[PDB]
Structure 1
Amino acid sequence: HHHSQDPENLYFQGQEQAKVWTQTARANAEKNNAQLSTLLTDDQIGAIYGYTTNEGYTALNPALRGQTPLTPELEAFTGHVTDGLNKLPAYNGETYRGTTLPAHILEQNQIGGTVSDGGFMSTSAKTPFDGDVSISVRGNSGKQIDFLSKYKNEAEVLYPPNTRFEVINRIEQNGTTHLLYREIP
């Protein structure tokens, strides 16, 4: 299933938004890290880039997380993103996700517990500013995708669906609950 065949239904019938994603993402990558670009096909790079658009993200990740139907089209979109992610060098270090979880979800994040989200998990190398919860993430299925942005500025490190993490640390400090996730491959 072609990347274009996958969001055809998310966009006006004329427009070939997969080609537009690919073109912008190629141009950004050429400017920001041209050699990384050669690792990705048109559909790989266009798919990852599409994940970072508003219309793309809100169509994809809610479906993978069970809030809306996961159609075969959304499934092939997912597969193109992860095919692309599989080509990129590993980000081996620590990244952060600043978020606010419903209390019954935060309650499930105890030391010794396990976490596995059906959606992608966005993190960033930068220290997060917002959120009731700061999730530190160590793994190395996560991949740096900032080179596909215009300014290469947000240091987004993207983890694919169903990466399993053990909750290996937790503390509340000032107003903020810190969690530590270690990928279990």
Structure 2
Amino acid sequence: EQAKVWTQTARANAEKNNAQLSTLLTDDQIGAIYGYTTNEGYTALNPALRGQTPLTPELEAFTGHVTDGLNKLPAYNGETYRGTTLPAHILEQNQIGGTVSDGGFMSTSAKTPFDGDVSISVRGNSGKQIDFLSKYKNEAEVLYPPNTRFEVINRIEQNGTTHLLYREIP
């Protein structure tokens, strides 16, 4: 019932926003990526991928559909941003030269971030733009799949925010 709502909602939005990209995605794939952008879908899925809750059969299938769909989309080759707040001991591990890798999906956006004590600039090309699946195509979300590795190649504290620069290491 839920997956069909996701598929039909995402399909309507994509046909408005970029109908040709829509054809790259199966019903299962487009509904799964859309579901990742809902609170119920994201809160069930990403904490399991990050090892906080168990990755159950239904969640395994969910992840596979998301990543199969992202794999069809064209590369976003550029810089995107994540505004966030990291625990002190995690930020301490983000030293220049360090490596980072999220077991979950990492949401970023092409837009300049507003909130968070940390602003992460992300350079890569495994991220995929998924804004065409939203109703207004307005948030420029670029989604990195699980276990993308990044090297911390720069860091600076400017005003109250720690800026980090991640380079994807394929």
Deviation at 1:76, TM superposition (A): 1.1
How many residue pairs get aligned? The number is 170
SS of residue paired to 1:95: strand
CA RMSD of aligned residues (A): 0.4
**TM-score normalised per structure 2:** 0.99
SS of residue paired to 2:75: coil
Q: Deviations over 1:54-103 (max 9, x none)?
A: 00000000111111111121111001000000000000010000000000
Q: Deviations over 1:2-26 (max 9, x none)?
A: xxxxxxxxxxxxxx11111000000
Q: Deviations over 1:22-74 (max 9, x none)?
A: 00000000000000000000001000000000000000001111111111211
Deviation at 1:151, TM superposition (A): 0.3
SS of residue paired to 2:78: coil
Distance 2:40 2:95 in 1: 34
Deviation at 1:119, TM superposition (A): 0.3
Which residue of 2 is the match for residue 102 of structure 1?
Answer: 87
Deviation at 1:124, TM superposition (A): 0.3
Q: Deviations over 1:83-128 (max 9, x none)?
A: 0000000000100000000000000000001001100000000000
Distance 1:159 1:35 in 2: 22
**TM-score normalised per structure 1:** 0.91
Flag structure 1 segments of 5+ consecutive residues without an equivalent: 1-15
Flag structure 2 segments of 5+ consecutive residues without an equivalent: none
Give aligned-pair identity as a percent.
Answer: 100
